[PDB]
Amino acid sequence: ADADPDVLKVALLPDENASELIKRNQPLKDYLEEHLDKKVQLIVTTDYSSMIEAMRFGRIDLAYFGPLSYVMAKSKSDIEPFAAMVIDGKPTYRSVIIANVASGVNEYADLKGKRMAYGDRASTSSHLIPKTVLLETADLTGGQDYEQHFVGTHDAVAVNVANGNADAGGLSEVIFNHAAERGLIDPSKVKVLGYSGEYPQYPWAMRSNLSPELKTKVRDVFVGIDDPEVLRNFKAEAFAPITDADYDVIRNMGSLLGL
């Protein structure tokens, strides 16, 4: 393994259409090349498990993980978290639970016997969080009291609810809120049922066998970002420093999934 590679392989959680993700992250790629003196190669894997496996086998250097996929990768490989974005004045985010207007689902209790869409099994806000909300508020258990279907991206959750393939679904609040704008769905076909509480934001992480000098530089460059052109694509105000213990809440909640 190379401690100080000339090219940095930088993976992005596949929570949306890969072209959308490459587009959104272009200004950050340009900023990193300038301030790190490295070439940057952006990667989007086919699913969450393939990004976790790429990290374990040393095939990527930096990764933008979700909270649950981060704690899963950290259990399998030697990695460290270093930054997360501050969006809307907070270092946290929420899941939204949505329903198709034609399904007969008017509240959480009405999901008994119906079809729920989740994203990836390793998703925080399109699986773990909404599943926990349905259990704690309505005493509903996935696969036992309702059908669960895993459709991949958060984009796919919104599409499958809106077109009638699912009756309800759970996903990231920010991703849902821009789905009509991007032309993914007709917003008249869906309604919001409710929201989760606030959970720690997606962490940036790197393989811990990079050199100490390179790891310090990566952390300093990200936390120092105040360029409006980089921040605007994310609707962010800053990149904040983080530690592994910030994700213990997710570890504890993950006991319900057998982690």
PDB file of C-alpha atoms in Angstrom:
ATOM      1  CA  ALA A   1       0.000   0.000   0.000  1.00  0.00           C
ATOM      2  CA  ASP A   2       1.218   3.470  -0.955  1.00  0.00           C
ATOM      3  CA  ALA A   3       1.393   5.930   1.961  1.00  0.00           C
ATOM      4  CA  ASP A   4       1.682   9.005  -0.293  1.00  0.00           C
ATOM      5  CA  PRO A   5       0.032   8.264  -3.701  1.00  0.00           C
ATOM      6  CA  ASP A   6       0.191  10.746  -6.649  1.00  0.00           C
ATOM      7  CA  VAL A   7      -3.517  10.075  -7.483  1.00  0.00           C
ATOM      8  CA  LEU A   8      -6.222  10.029  -4.794  1.00  0.00           C
ATOM      9  CA  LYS A   9      -9.185   7.725  -5.473  1.00  0.00           C
ATOM     10  CA  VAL A  10     -12.229   9.465  -3.860  1.00  0.00           C
ATOM     11  CA  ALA A  11     -15.527   7.505  -3.605  1.00  0.00           C
ATOM     12  CA  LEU A  12     -18.998   9.066  -3.125  1.00  0.00           C
ATOM     13  CA  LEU A  13     -21.934   7.249  -1.405  1.00  0.00           C
ATOM     14  CA  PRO A  14     -24.302   6.124  -4.234  1.00  0.00           C
ATOM     15  CA  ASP A  15     -27.431   7.726  -2.677  1.00  0.00           C
ATOM     16  CA  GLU A  16     -28.545   9.313  -5.996  1.00  0.00           C
ATOM     17  CA  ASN A  17     -27.985   9.073  -9.800  1.00  0.00           C
ATOM     18  CA  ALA A  18     -24.201   8.832 -10.398  1.00  0.00           C
ATOM     19  CA  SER A  19     -24.154  11.722 -12.931  1.00  0.00           C
ATOM     20  CA  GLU A  20     -25.848  14.037 -10.416  1.00  0.00           C
ATOM     21  CA  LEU A  21     -23.196  13.123  -7.804  1.00  0.00           C
ATOM     22  CA  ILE A  22     -20.246  13.742 -10.187  1.00  0.00           C
ATOM     23  CA  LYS A  23     -21.784  17.113 -11.175  1.00  0.00           C
ATOM     24  CA  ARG A  24     -22.358  18.242  -7.559  1.00  0.00           C
ATOM     25  CA  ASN A  25     -18.803  17.337  -6.465  1.00  0.00           C
ATOM     26  CA  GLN A  26     -16.899  18.916  -9.400  1.00  0.00           C
ATOM     27  CA  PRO A  27     -16.076  22.211  -7.601  1.00  0.00           C
ATOM     28  CA  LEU A  28     -14.833  20.261  -4.581  1.00  0.00           C
ATOM     29  CA  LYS A  29     -12.624  18.063  -6.868  1.00  0.00           C
ATOM     30  CA  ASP A  30     -11.052  21.226  -8.356  1.00  0.00           C
ATOM     31  CA  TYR A  31     -10.487  22.718  -4.847  1.00  0.00           C
ATOM     32  CA  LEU A  32      -8.813  19.504  -3.602  1.00  0.00           C
ATOM     33  CA  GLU A  33      -6.438  19.270  -6.613  1.00  0.00           C
ATOM     34  CA  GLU A  34      -5.334  22.888  -6.010  1.00  0.00           C
ATOM     35  CA  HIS A  35      -4.714  22.654  -2.266  1.00  0.00           C
ATOM     36  CA  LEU A  36      -3.419  19.008  -1.981  1.00  0.00           C
ATOM     37  CA  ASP A  37      -1.037  18.752  -5.029  1.00  0.00           C
ATOM     38  CA  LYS A  38      -2.618  15.493  -6.106  1.00  0.00           C
ATOM     39  CA  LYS A  39      -4.723  14.296  -9.013  1.00  0.00           C
ATOM     40  CA  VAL A  40      -8.245  13.359  -7.830  1.00  0.00           C
ATOM     41  CA  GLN A  41     -10.287  10.552  -9.405  1.00  0.00           C
ATOM     42  CA  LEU A  42     -14.034  10.567  -8.428  1.00  0.00           C
ATOM     43  CA  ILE A  43     -15.622   7.093  -8.133  1.00  0.00           C
ATOM     44  CA  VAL A  44     -19.308   6.069  -7.753  1.00  0.00           C
ATOM     45  CA  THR A  45     -19.792   2.331  -6.974  1.00  0.00           C
ATOM     46  CA  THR A  46     -22.931   0.325  -7.944  1.00  0.00           C
ATOM     47  CA  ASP A  47     -24.174   0.006  -4.318  1.00  0.00           C
ATOM     48  CA  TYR A  48     -23.217   0.554  -0.621  1.00  0.00           C
ATOM     49  CA  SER A  49     -21.685  -2.925  -0.043  1.00  0.00           C
ATOM     50  CA  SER A  50     -19.333  -2.520  -3.026  1.00  0.00           C
ATOM     51  CA  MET A  51     -18.059   0.829  -1.630  1.00  0.00           C
ATOM     52  CA  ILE A  52     -17.469  -0.803   1.839  1.00  0.00           C
ATOM     53  CA  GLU A  53     -15.606  -3.734   0.157  1.00  0.00           C
ATOM     54  CA  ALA A  54     -13.492  -1.382  -2.009  1.00  0.00           C
ATOM     55  CA  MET A  55     -12.369   0.392   1.187  1.00  0.00           C
ATOM     56  CA  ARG A  56     -11.492  -2.901   2.972  1.00  0.00           C
ATOM     57  CA  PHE A  57      -9.352  -4.075   0.034  1.00  0.00           C
ATOM     58  CA  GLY A  58      -7.390  -0.760  -0.248  1.00  0.00           C
ATOM     59  CA  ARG A  59      -8.849   0.208  -3.650  1.00  0.00           C
ATOM     60  CA  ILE A  60     -10.002   3.714  -2.596  1.00  0.00           C
ATOM     61  CA  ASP A  61      -8.231   6.333  -0.483  1.00  0.00           C
ATOM     62  CA  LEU A  62     -10.980   8.764   0.675  1.00  0.00           C
ATOM     63  CA  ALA A  63     -14.712   7.981   0.963  1.00  0.00           C
ATOM     64  CA  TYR A  64     -17.868  10.107   1.557  1.00  0.00           C
ATOM     65  CA  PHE A  65     -19.848   7.567   3.634  1.00  0.00           C
ATOM     66  CA  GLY A  66     -23.313   7.620   5.219  1.00  0.00           C
ATOM     67  CA  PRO A  67     -23.362   7.172   8.991  1.00  0.00           C
ATOM     68  CA  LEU A  68     -24.343   3.428   8.994  1.00  0.00           C
ATOM     69  CA  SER A  69     -22.007   2.486   6.100  1.00  0.00           C
ATOM     70  CA  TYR A  70     -19.178   4.317   7.915  1.00  0.00           C
ATOM     71  CA  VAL A  71     -19.619   2.283  11.157  1.00  0.00           C
ATOM     72  CA  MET A  72     -19.844  -0.958   9.091  1.00  0.00           C
ATOM     73  CA  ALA A  73     -16.598  -0.118   7.210  1.00  0.00           C
ATOM     74  CA  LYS A  74     -14.852   0.902  10.479  1.00  0.00           C
ATOM     75  CA  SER A  75     -15.660  -2.592  11.914  1.00  0.00           C
ATOM     76  CA  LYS A  76     -13.908  -4.256   8.890  1.00  0.00           C
ATOM     77  CA  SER A  77     -10.949  -1.931   8.106  1.00  0.00           C
ATOM     78  CA  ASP A  78      -8.584   0.649   9.562  1.00  0.00           C
ATOM     79  CA  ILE A  79     -10.092   4.031   8.603  1.00  0.00           C
ATOM     80  CA  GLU A  80     -10.626   7.412  10.288  1.00  0.00           C
ATOM     81  CA  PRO A  81     -13.365  10.075   9.970  1.00  0.00           C
ATOM     82  CA  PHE A  82     -12.275  13.697   9.505  1.00  0.00           C
ATOM     83  CA  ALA A  83     -15.061  16.088   8.297  1.00  0.00           C
ATOM     84  CA  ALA A  84     -18.831  16.524   7.925  1.00  0.00           C
ATOM     85  CA  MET A  85     -20.864  19.370   6.408  1.00  0.00           C
ATOM     86  CA  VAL A  86     -22.841  21.974   8.373  1.00  0.00           C
ATOM     87  CA  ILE A  87     -26.146  22.498   6.472  1.00  0.00           C
ATOM     88  CA  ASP A  88     -29.040  24.785   7.707  1.00  0.00           C
ATOM     89  CA  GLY A  89     -27.118  25.702  10.851  1.00  0.00           C
ATOM     90  CA  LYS A  90     -26.698  22.199  12.212  1.00  0.00           C
ATOM     91  CA  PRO A  91     -24.373  19.191  12.030  1.00  0.00           C
ATOM     92  CA  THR A  92     -27.322  16.717  11.839  1.00  0.00           C
ATOM     93  CA  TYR A  93     -30.019  15.588   9.372  1.00  0.00           C
ATOM     94  CA  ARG A  94     -33.424  13.783   9.341  1.00  0.00           C
ATOM     95  CA  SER A  95     -35.299  11.023   7.507  1.00  0.00           C
ATOM     96  CA  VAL A  96     -38.769  11.738   5.976  1.00  0.00           C
ATOM     97  CA  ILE A  97     -41.519   9.062   5.624  1.00  0.00           C
ATOM     98  CA  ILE A  98     -43.727   9.630   2.528  1.00  0.00           C
ATOM     99  CA  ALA A  99     -46.895   7.948   1.101  1.00  0.00           C
ATOM    100  CA  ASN A 100     -48.549   7.647  -2.287  1.00  0.00           C
ATOM    101  CA  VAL A 101     -51.845   9.646  -2.251  1.00  0.00           C
ATOM    102  CA  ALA A 102     -53.692   6.731  -3.940  1.00  0.00           C
ATOM    103  CA  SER A 103     -52.625   3.962  -1.509  1.00  0.00           C
ATOM    104  CA  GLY A 104     -55.136   4.405   1.339  1.00  0.00           C
ATOM    105  CA  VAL A 105     -52.248   5.125   3.728  1.00  0.00           C
ATOM    106  CA  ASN A 106     -53.198   8.170   5.781  1.00  0.00           C
ATOM    107  CA  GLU A 107     -51.036   7.536   8.910  1.00  0.00           C
ATOM    108  CA  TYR A 108     -48.236   5.101  10.090  1.00  0.00           C
ATOM    109  CA  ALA A 109     -50.724   2.577  11.453  1.00  0.00           C
ATOM    110  CA  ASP A 110     -52.265   2.154   7.981  1.00  0.00           C
ATOM    111  CA  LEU A 111     -48.993   0.564   6.705  1.00  0.00           C
ATOM    112  CA  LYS A 112     -50.046  -2.816   8.172  1.00  0.00           C
ATOM    113  CA  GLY A 113     -50.150  -5.294   5.249  1.00  0.00           C
ATOM    114  CA  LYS A 114     -48.880  -2.686   2.712  1.00  0.00           C
ATOM    115  CA  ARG A 115     -45.611  -2.139   0.716  1.00  0.00           C
ATOM    116  CA  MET A 116     -42.768  -0.025   2.215  1.00  0.00           C
ATOM    117  CA  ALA A 117     -39.826   1.108   0.050  1.00  0.00           C
ATOM    118  CA  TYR A 118     -36.310   1.347   1.609  1.00  0.00           C
ATOM    119  CA  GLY A 119     -33.097   2.219  -0.309  1.00  0.00           C
ATOM    120  CA  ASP A 120     -29.965   0.141   0.453  1.00  0.00           C
ATOM    121  CA  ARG A 121     -29.878  -2.255   3.438  1.00  0.00           C
ATOM    122  CA  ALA A 122     -26.766  -0.283   4.628  1.00  0.00           C
ATOM    123  CA  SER A 123     -28.566   3.112   4.504  1.00  0.00           C
ATOM    124  CA  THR A 124     -29.070   5.252   7.620  1.00  0.00           C
ATOM    125  CA  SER A 125     -31.942   7.523   6.452  1.00  0.00           C
ATOM    126  CA  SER A 126     -33.477   5.189   3.786  1.00  0.00           C
ATOM    127  CA  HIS A 127     -33.502   2.053   6.035  1.00  0.00           C
ATOM    128  CA  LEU A 128     -32.308   2.084   9.700  1.00  0.00           C
ATOM    129  CA  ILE A 129     -33.939   5.381  10.824  1.00  0.00           C
ATOM    130  CA  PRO A 130     -37.393   5.007   9.174  1.00  0.00           C
ATOM    131  CA  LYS A 131     -37.610   1.335  10.234  1.00  0.00           C
ATOM    132  CA  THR A 132     -36.927   2.438  13.839  1.00  0.00           C
ATOM    133  CA  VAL A 133     -39.596   5.205  13.610  1.00  0.00           C
ATOM    134  CA  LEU A 134     -42.271   2.727  12.424  1.00  0.00           C
ATOM    135  CA  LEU A 135     -41.424   0.283  15.278  1.00  0.00           C
ATOM    136  CA  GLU A 136     -41.311   2.905  18.087  1.00  0.00           C
ATOM    137  CA  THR A 137     -44.456   4.846  16.974  1.00  0.00           C
ATOM    138  CA  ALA A 138     -46.762   2.142  15.503  1.00  0.00           C
ATOM    139  CA  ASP A 139     -45.275  -1.186  16.750  1.00  0.00           C
ATOM    140  CA  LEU A 140     -44.718  -2.369  13.160  1.00  0.00           C
ATOM    141  CA  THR A 141     -41.917  -4.921  12.348  1.00  0.00           C
ATOM    142  CA  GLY A 142     -40.533  -5.106   8.803  1.00  0.00           C
ATOM    143  CA  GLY A 143     -41.213  -8.345   6.905  1.00  0.00           C
ATOM    144  CA  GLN A 144     -43.641  -9.481   9.647  1.00  0.00           C
ATOM    145  CA  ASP A 145     -46.284  -6.704   9.695  1.00  0.00           C
ATOM    146  CA  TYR A 146     -45.608  -5.102   6.282  1.00  0.00           C
ATOM    147  CA  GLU A 147     -43.699  -5.959   3.076  1.00  0.00           C
ATOM    148  CA  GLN A 148     -40.237  -4.388   2.717  1.00  0.00           C
ATOM    149  CA  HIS A 149     -38.673  -3.738  -0.715  1.00  0.00           C
ATOM    150  CA  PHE A 150     -35.078  -2.446  -1.152  1.00  0.00           C
ATOM    151  CA  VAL A 151     -34.885  -0.293  -4.311  1.00  0.00           C
ATOM    152  CA  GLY A 152     -31.325   1.103  -3.995  1.00  0.00           C
ATOM    153  CA  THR A 153     -30.921   4.850  -4.153  1.00  0.00           C
ATOM    154  CA  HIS A 154     -32.918   7.534  -2.277  1.00  0.00           C
ATOM    155  CA  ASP A 155     -33.930   8.726  -5.802  1.00  0.00           C
ATOM    156  CA  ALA A 156     -35.464   5.249  -6.345  1.00  0.00           C
ATOM    157  CA  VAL A 157     -37.431   5.382  -3.076  1.00  0.00           C
ATOM    158  CA  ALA A 158     -39.087   8.684  -4.214  1.00  0.00           C
ATOM    159  CA  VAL A 159     -39.766   7.321  -7.745  1.00  0.00           C
ATOM    160  CA  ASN A 160     -41.274   3.973  -6.526  1.00  0.00           C
ATOM    161  CA  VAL A 161     -43.607   5.722  -4.018  1.00  0.00           C
ATOM    162  CA  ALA A 162     -44.738   8.325  -6.548  1.00  0.00           C
ATOM    163  CA  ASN A 163     -45.482   5.799  -9.335  1.00  0.00           C
ATOM    164  CA  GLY A 164     -47.444   3.326  -7.108  1.00  0.00           C
ATOM    165  CA  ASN A 165     -44.951   0.411  -7.007  1.00  0.00           C
ATOM    166  CA  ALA A 166     -44.726   1.109  -3.243  1.00  0.00           C
ATOM    167  CA  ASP A 167     -47.404   2.537  -0.940  1.00  0.00           C
ATOM    168  CA  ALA A 168     -44.929   4.339   1.436  1.00  0.00           C
ATOM    169  CA  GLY A 169     -41.172   4.826   1.815  1.00  0.00           C
ATOM    170  CA  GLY A 170     -38.384   6.418   3.840  1.00  0.00           C
ATOM    171  CA  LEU A 171     -35.464   8.593   2.640  1.00  0.00           C
ATOM    172  CA  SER A 172     -33.257  11.641   3.399  1.00  0.00           C
ATOM    173  CA  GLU A 173     -35.279  14.869   3.881  1.00  0.00           C
ATOM    174  CA  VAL A 174     -32.950  16.923   1.631  1.00  0.00           C
ATOM    175  CA  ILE A 175     -32.990  14.392  -1.181  1.00  0.00           C
ATOM    176  CA  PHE A 176     -36.818  14.206  -1.115  1.00  0.00           C
ATOM    177  CA  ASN A 177     -37.202  17.981  -1.090  1.00  0.00           C
ATOM    178  CA  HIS A 178     -35.310  18.383  -4.401  1.00  0.00           C
ATOM    179  CA  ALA A 179     -36.834  15.362  -6.186  1.00  0.00           C
ATOM    180  CA  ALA A 180     -39.618  17.367  -7.982  1.00  0.00           C
ATOM    181  CA  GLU A 181     -37.136  20.121  -8.989  1.00  0.00           C
ATOM    182  CA  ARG A 182     -34.914  17.490 -10.676  1.00  0.00           C
ATOM    183  CA  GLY A 183     -37.929  16.073 -12.619  1.00  0.00           C
ATOM    184  CA  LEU A 184     -37.837  12.686 -10.857  1.00  0.00           C
ATOM    185  CA  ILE A 185     -41.423  12.736  -9.591  1.00  0.00           C
ATOM    186  CA  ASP A 186     -44.808  14.473  -9.866  1.00  0.00           C
ATOM    187  CA  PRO A 187     -45.109  16.049  -6.354  1.00  0.00           C
ATOM    188  CA  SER A 188     -48.950  15.885  -6.447  1.00  0.00           C
ATOM    189  CA  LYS A 189     -48.728  12.065  -6.215  1.00  0.00           C
ATOM    190  CA  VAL A 190     -47.055  11.982  -2.751  1.00  0.00           C
ATOM    191  CA  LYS A 191     -47.569  13.412   0.744  1.00  0.00           C
ATOM    192  CA  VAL A 192     -45.405  13.550   3.878  1.00  0.00           C
ATOM    193  CA  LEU A 193     -46.432  11.320   6.828  1.00  0.00           C
ATOM    194  CA  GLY A 194     -43.722  12.416   9.268  1.00  0.00           C
ATOM    195  CA  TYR A 195     -40.061  12.966  10.194  1.00  0.00           C
ATOM    196  CA  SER A 196     -37.409  11.349  12.385  1.00  0.00           C
ATOM    197  CA  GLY A 197     -35.294  13.079  14.996  1.00  0.00           C
ATOM    198  CA  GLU A 198     -31.868  14.578  14.193  1.00  0.00           C
ATOM    199  CA  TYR A 199     -28.885  12.206  13.517  1.00  0.00           C
ATOM    200  CA  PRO A 200     -25.159  12.930  12.870  1.00  0.00           C
ATOM    201  CA  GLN A 201     -24.304  14.042   9.297  1.00  0.00           C
ATOM    202  CA  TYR A 202     -22.502  11.896   6.628  1.00  0.00           C
ATOM    203  CA  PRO A 203     -18.778  11.529   7.445  1.00  0.00           C
ATOM    204  CA  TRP A 204     -15.771  11.883   5.148  1.00  0.00           C
ATOM    205  CA  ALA A 205     -13.212   9.159   6.000  1.00  0.00           C
ATOM    206  CA  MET A 206      -9.754   8.011   4.826  1.00  0.00           C
ATOM    207  CA  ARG A 207      -7.620   4.875   5.042  1.00  0.00           C
ATOM    208  CA  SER A 208      -5.415   5.139   8.140  1.00  0.00           C
ATOM    209  CA  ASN A 209      -2.257   3.806   6.375  1.00  0.00           C
ATOM    210  CA  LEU A 210      -1.786   7.073   4.483  1.00  0.00           C
ATOM    211  CA  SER A 211       1.275   8.919   5.869  1.00  0.00           C
ATOM    212  CA  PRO A 212       0.787  11.077   9.003  1.00  0.00           C
ATOM    213  CA  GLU A 213       1.850  14.150   6.951  1.00  0.00           C
ATOM    214  CA  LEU A 214      -0.742  13.464   4.211  1.00  0.00           C
ATOM    215  CA  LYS A 215      -3.527  12.722   6.749  1.00  0.00           C
ATOM    216  CA  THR A 216      -2.917  16.083   8.519  1.00  0.00           C
ATOM    217  CA  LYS A 217      -2.999  17.936   5.188  1.00  0.00           C
ATOM    218  CA  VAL A 218      -6.278  16.234   4.054  1.00  0.00           C
ATOM    219  CA  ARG A 219      -7.971  17.106   7.368  1.00  0.00           C
ATOM    220  CA  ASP A 220      -6.715  20.741   7.294  1.00  0.00           C
ATOM    221  CA  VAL A 221      -7.779  21.322   3.640  1.00  0.00           C
ATOM    222  CA  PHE A 222     -11.348  20.057   4.194  1.00  0.00           C
ATOM    223  CA  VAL A 223     -11.965  21.839   7.526  1.00  0.00           C
ATOM    224  CA  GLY A 224     -10.529  25.075   6.015  1.00  0.00           C
ATOM    225  CA  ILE A 225     -13.045  25.262   3.104  1.00  0.00           C
ATOM    226  CA  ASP A 226     -14.792  28.683   2.948  1.00  0.00           C
ATOM    227  CA  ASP A 227     -15.003  29.135  -0.853  1.00  0.00           C
ATOM    228  CA  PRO A 228     -18.653  30.021  -1.726  1.00  0.00           C
ATOM    229  CA  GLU A 229     -18.488  28.201  -5.108  1.00  0.00           C
ATOM    230  CA  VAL A 230     -17.622  24.913  -3.328  1.00  0.00           C
ATOM    231  CA  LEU A 231     -20.183  25.387  -0.532  1.00  0.00           C
ATOM    232  CA  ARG A 232     -23.105  26.475  -2.767  1.00  0.00           C
ATOM    233  CA  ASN A 233     -23.526  23.134  -4.569  1.00  0.00           C
ATOM    234  CA  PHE A 234     -24.038  21.469  -1.179  1.00  0.00           C
ATOM    235  CA  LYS A 235     -26.125  24.342   0.286  1.00  0.00           C
ATOM    236  CA  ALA A 236     -23.546  24.177   3.128  1.00  0.00           C
ATOM    237  CA  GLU A 237     -21.982  26.794   5.435  1.00  0.00           C
ATOM    238  CA  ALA A 238     -18.811  24.902   6.496  1.00  0.00           C
ATOM    239  CA  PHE A 239     -17.012  21.551   6.861  1.00  0.00           C
ATOM    240  CA  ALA A 240     -16.737  20.701  10.592  1.00  0.00           C
ATOM    241  CA  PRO A 241     -14.248  18.427  12.378  1.00  0.00           C
ATOM    242  CA  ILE A 242     -15.610  15.071  13.681  1.00  0.00           C
ATOM    243  CA  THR A 243     -14.591  12.006  15.713  1.00  0.00           C
ATOM    244  CA  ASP A 244     -15.516   8.280  15.630  1.00  0.00           C
ATOM    245  CA  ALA A 245     -17.474   8.556  18.931  1.00  0.00           C
ATOM    246  CA  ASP A 246     -19.971  10.916  17.210  1.00  0.00           C
ATOM    247  CA  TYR A 247     -21.357   7.748  15.474  1.00  0.00           C
ATOM    248  CA  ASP A 248     -21.906   5.630  18.632  1.00  0.00           C
ATOM    249  CA  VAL A 249     -25.628   6.557  18.537  1.00  0.00           C
ATOM    250  CA  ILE A 250     -25.761   4.762  15.119  1.00  0.00           C
ATOM    251  CA  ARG A 251     -23.880   1.713  16.475  1.00  0.00           C
ATOM    252  CA  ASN A 252     -26.426   1.389  19.262  1.00  0.00           C
ATOM    253  CA  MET A 253     -29.445   1.745  16.923  1.00  0.00           C
ATOM    254  CA  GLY A 254     -27.869  -0.809  14.549  1.00  0.00           C
ATOM    255  CA  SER A 255     -28.391  -3.610  17.132  1.00  0.00           C
ATOM    256  CA  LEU A 256     -31.976  -3.798  15.679  1.00  0.00           C
ATOM    257  CA  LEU A 257     -30.459  -4.832  12.287  1.00  0.00           C
ATOM    258  CA  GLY A 258     -28.118  -7.441  13.830  1.00  0.00           C
ATOM    259  CA  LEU A 259     -24.909  -5.374  13.676  1.00  0.00           C
TER     260      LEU A 259
END
